[PDB]
């Protein structure tokens, strides 16, 4: 009601020039919510407009903000140059503690340290952050971005302690207080304990906090897929998460992580035809949610629509996050039953195993898929020499893993003594292989006799050549 009319007046004056000076400033001043390129263009001619009436250097608040724009753009380097020349122009504001160029330099340095984090120049990011905190320790965001940086290293660092002292300096601070429990998301065994550490600022001054209450829904959904649903316990959990999701539904129709949660809990309720629709909505809403890519393909493989699923899996792999995400290739290799769903499935398992050789489940699953391809080549086959020669080696390897996993105690909370019936299988597969390798020698000897048969007749055609020559 004040912003659309602002847009109208701004494009009432942008084409005009009644000595427009700041007209681009209050153009872009609303454009930062909107398209960023419009703000860039406004700053572009605004940089010029301060030069012709008098050759006046651009105040550093402009230059810091245009670097801030380029931060969310690809123009990271000249964003850095903007922050440098911003700090210089603030230094050129030598006497302006009324305007508090020092404070402007403080937030400019904050932006530049956030930029060094985008360079992954965490060393200089540390430098700028500790320069500000040693001079303004009352500030919190620098106090926790440092904590976030060590969170990238890990949880029980001074990451967690900068985070807790950020609450010590400001316990009213909802962002840091949320980040406290965000740390505790790593410890999922601290699942039911997160009620308390996400209750502390359920004081109604902080309420409504959509972010935290969705976090309650998420820590409440990770409770699911347990064998206690038949005991009505996870049914109550499903309906409780549903109640949270109804609450966030009514207070916000346009949240999308909510609708992802509703679709997830009803998919856990077994309504997968009733799930692809609700996920389709958030799909057009924004594709750039990593979760919905997975949850749609779970439905697809639930209709066994692999040729619709694995492509969107690797589409989720198109983010610059991790070259072998583990659960994605797990959720890829589910009912994969065709040829590339077997051998290239093995290749995917090898890619996962390369960075994750610790997993018992993964070495079980490679043994499983090797078993499948071994029984695919020895039963109605009547197949090549070399591949059935590889078959005995690969099933021997599979038996090595059958033995190896069975000696290990801990499993995925389901003991894998199931390798034992695989061991009887692979023994009878040894018998079948000894059957079929004889057939391999038979096909070798008959191909020898037929090549002798072509040798003799081509000798005969040279004989006809000799008759025509004479």
């Amino acid at each position: 009601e004040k912003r659309d009319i602002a847009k109208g007046h701004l494009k009432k004056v942008t084409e005009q020039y009644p000595d427009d000076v700041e007209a681009w400033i209050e153009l872009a001043q609303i454009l930062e919510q909107t398209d960023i390129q419009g703000a860039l263009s406004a700053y572009g001619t605004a940089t010029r407009i301060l030069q012709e009436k008098v050759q006046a250097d651009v105040p550093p608040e402009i230059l810091n903000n245009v670097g801030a724009l380029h931060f969310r753009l690809g123009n990271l380097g000249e964003a850095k140059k903007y922050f440098l020349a911003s700090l210089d122009r603030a230094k050129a504001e030598a006497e302006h503690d009324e305007h508090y160029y020092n404070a402007i330099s403080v937030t400019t340095s904050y932006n530049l340290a956030r930029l060094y984090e985008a360079m992954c120049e965490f060393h200089e990011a540390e430098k700028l952050y500790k320069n500000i905190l040693r001079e303004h320790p009352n500030y919190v965001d620098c106090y926790l971005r440092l904590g976030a940086m060590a969170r990238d290293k890990g949880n029980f660092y001074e990451a967690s302690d900068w985070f807790k002292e950020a609450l010590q300096i400001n316990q009213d601070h909802p962002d840091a207080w949320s980040l406290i429990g965000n740390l505790h998301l790593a410890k999922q065994e601290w699942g039911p304990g997160q009620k308390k550490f996400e209750r502390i600022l359920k004081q109604p001054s902080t309420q409504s906090d959509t972010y935290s209450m969705l976090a309650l829904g998420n820590v409440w959904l990770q409770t699911l897929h347990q064998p206690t649903r038949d005991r009505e316990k996870e049914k109550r959990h499903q309906d409780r998460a549903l109640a949270i999701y109804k609450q966030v539904l009514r207070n916000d129709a346009k949240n999308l992580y909510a609708a992802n949660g509703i679709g997830a809990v009803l998919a856990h309720k077994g309504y997968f035809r009733e799930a692809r629709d609700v996920f389709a909505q958030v799909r057009e809403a924004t594709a750039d949610i990593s979760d919905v890519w997975l949850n749609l393909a779970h439905i697809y493989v639930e209709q066994k629509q692999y040729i619709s699923a694995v492509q969107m899996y690797e589409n989720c792999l198109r983010k610059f996050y991790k070259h072998q995400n583990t659960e994605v290739v797990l959720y890829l290799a589910r009912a994969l039953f065709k040829c590339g769903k077997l051998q290239e499935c093995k290749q995917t398992l090898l890619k996962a195993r390369h960075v994750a050789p610790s997993d018992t489940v993964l070495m079980f699953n490679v043994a499983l898929v090797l078993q499948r391809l071994a029984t695919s080549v020895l039963k109605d086959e009547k197949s090549n020499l070399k591949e059935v020669l590889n078959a005995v080696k690969e099933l021997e390897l599979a038996h090595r893993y059958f033995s190896y996993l069975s000696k290990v105690g801990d499993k995925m909370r389901f003991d894998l003594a199931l390798a034992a019936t695989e061991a009887r299988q692979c023994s009878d597969l040894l018998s079948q292989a000894q059957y079929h390798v004889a057939r391999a020698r038979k096909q070798d000897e008959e191909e020898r006799e037929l090549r002798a048969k072509q040798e003799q007749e081509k000798e005969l055609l040279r004989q006809k050549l000799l008759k025509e020559q004479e």
Binding site: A68, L221, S290
Partner: peptide, 25 residues
Amino acid sequence: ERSGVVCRVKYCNSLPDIPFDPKFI
């Protein structure tokens, strides 16, 4: 074969963290 590949199938849901957009004076 007799049964499919084993998984702890979950319809999980992730959260974005705090953005910290560079500030606008």
